[PDB]
Design a protein around this ligand. Structure first.
Ligand SMILES: *[C@@H](C)[C@H]1/C(=C/c2[nH]c(/C=C3N=C(/C=C4\NC(=O)C(CC)=C4C)C(C)=C\3CCC(=O)O)c(CCC(=O)O)c2C)NC(=O)[C@@H]1C
Ligand SMILES: *[C@H](C)[C@H]1/C(=C/c2[nH]c(/C=C3N=C(/C=C4\NC(=O)C(CC)=C4C)C(C)=C\3CCC(=O)O)c(CCC(=O)O)c2C)NC(=O)[C@@H]1C
Ligand SMILES: *[C@H](C)[C@H]1/C(=C/c2[nH]c(/C=C3N=C(/C=C4\NC(=O)C(CC)=C4C)C(C)=C\3CCC(=O)O)c(CCC(=O)O)c2C)NC(=O)[C@@H]1C
Lengths: 162, 172
């Protein structure tokens, strides 16, 4: 999984080397950032139920067809609505993981790799998720470093969708 | 490979959970020992040649049959291979100490080792004595209270000894 520490270890191993001050200065950068990361992880998690439900509602307002059009890919049924907020809660849960490890590894590994195939097969529009993710960023209530680095991961997801 | 952080996340994802406040505090405690861990990585790295040489010197003194003609570490190519193996195992122990997880040591280093030696005719249990002599030396260099800020490294020291012990029980 991609984290600052597994990146540093991989670079040294790729060159058959022991670690040097280079890789130690990466650990130092990660450990000093980890307070804001972890304080942000705790905050999102406390709000997670309410952001996910608010983000689903924000999509359903931007795109009212998703609640009125017929077909299993839409939220016009109870199952569809359940599936939708479940999905958004997965994005949010991945972003908290990313905070905990300090990098995009949980997103890449669990969510991003494959998602195009899924979206096309099940006819789910990327634009629905980019909307949900712009809500989350506008409403998570973080500030300072915590917010800058949580937004980093949210914008990474957005750019994978666009 | 995983680090100590990733490892927790990957056990949470399989259950579908967010980390608990408890889990987050425990990772904070790990970050708190950040500098101490880097001093252990720094110190063992900085003496890596000497740890290897002195370890091999004592192994061959205790076990002279490995170097007698016909011995698994007799001839230059075999001796060079043996010292190479000792350096490799130390290097991946220092990787695990850096990342605070054994993934990389098991995955990249130990996995299939014992069957390699079994196929080669290399005495795994002598390999394990070599690893143990590198362990004691490294715990002594990393624990030296000179020229460092005094504090408590005791869990870290326990965590280090386990990675050596994991290496020794793997090949033996
Ligand atoms: C147990 C391992 C021993 C021990 C460790 C210990 N070290 C610190 C403090 C720090 N160690 C460093 C590390 C480095 N600085 C660098 O520039 C480099 C090379 C690139 C390294 C590896 C740093 C920056 C610190 C903090 C500053 C300082 O010098 O104090 C402590 C104090 C706790 C802390 O994290 O601040 C401790 C306890 N101490 C022992 O007694 C054991 C033998
Ligand atoms: C919400 C913004 C909109 C929406 C939701 C909706 N999604 C699905 C079905 C799927 N969603 C996923 C996605 C994931 N599964 C994963 O494992 C991961 C990463 C951890 C993600 C992000 C998948 C794979 C499916 C299909 C399989 C399944 O049903 O679980 C549906 C159902 C689609 C169907 O045809 O059955 C719906 C309704 N729909 C909307 O209209 C909302 C605006
Ligand atoms: C020294 C303490 C003991 C010893 C060692 C010995 N090892 C080899 C041969 C091999 N050792 C390895 C192990 C690895 N290679 C890797 O790349 C990795 C990590 C990524 C490991 C752990 C392997 C694969 C070999 C085989 C390839 C090779 O020989 O180069 C030898 C050579 C055996 C031979 O017949 O040439 C020896 C001698 N011998 C002892 O007596 C000590 C107890």
């Amino acid at each position: 999984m991609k984290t600052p520490l597994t990146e540093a270890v991989a670079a040294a191993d790729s060159q058959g080397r022991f670690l040097s001050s280079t890789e130690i200065q990466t650990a130092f950068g990660r450990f000093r950032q980890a307070s804001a990361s972890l304080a942000a992880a705790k905050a999102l998690t406390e709000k997670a139920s309410s952001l996910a439900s608010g983000a689903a509602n924000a999509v359903y307002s931007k795109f009212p067809y998703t609640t009125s059009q017929n077909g299993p890919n839409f939220a016009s049924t109870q199952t569809g609505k359940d599936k939708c907020v479940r999905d958004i809660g997965y994005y949010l849960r991945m972003v908290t993981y990313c905070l905990v490890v300090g990098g995009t590894g949980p997103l890449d590994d669990y969510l991003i790799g494959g998602i195009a195939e899924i979206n096309r097969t099940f006819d789910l529009s990327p634009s629905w998720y980019v909307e949900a993710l712009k809500y989350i960023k506008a409403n998570h209530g973080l500030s300072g470093d915590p917010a800058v680095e949580a937004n980093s991961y949210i914008d990474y997801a957005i750019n994978a969708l666009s | 490979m995983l680090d100590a952080f990733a490892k927790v996340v990957s056990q949470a994802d399989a259950r579908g959970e967010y980390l608990s406040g408890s889990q987050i505090d425990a990772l904070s405690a790990l970050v708190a020992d950040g500098n101490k861990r880097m001093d252990v990585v720094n110190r063992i790295t900085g003496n890596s040649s000497t740890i290897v040489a002195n370890a091999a010197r004592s192994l061959f003194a205790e076990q002279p049959q490995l170097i007698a003609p016909g011995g698994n570490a007799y001839t230059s190519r075999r001796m060079a291979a043996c010292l190479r193996d000792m350096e490799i195992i130390l290097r991946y122990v220092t990787y695990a100490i850096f990342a605070g997880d054994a993934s990389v040591l098991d995955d990249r280093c130990l996995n299939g080792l014992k069957e390699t030696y079994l196929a080669l005719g290399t005495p795994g249990s002598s390999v394990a004595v070599g690893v143990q002599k590198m362990k004691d030396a490294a715990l002594a260099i990393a624990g030296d209270t000179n020229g460092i800020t005094r504090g408590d490294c005791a869990s870290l020291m326990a965590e280090v000894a386990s990675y050596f012990d994991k290496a020794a029980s793997a090949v033996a």
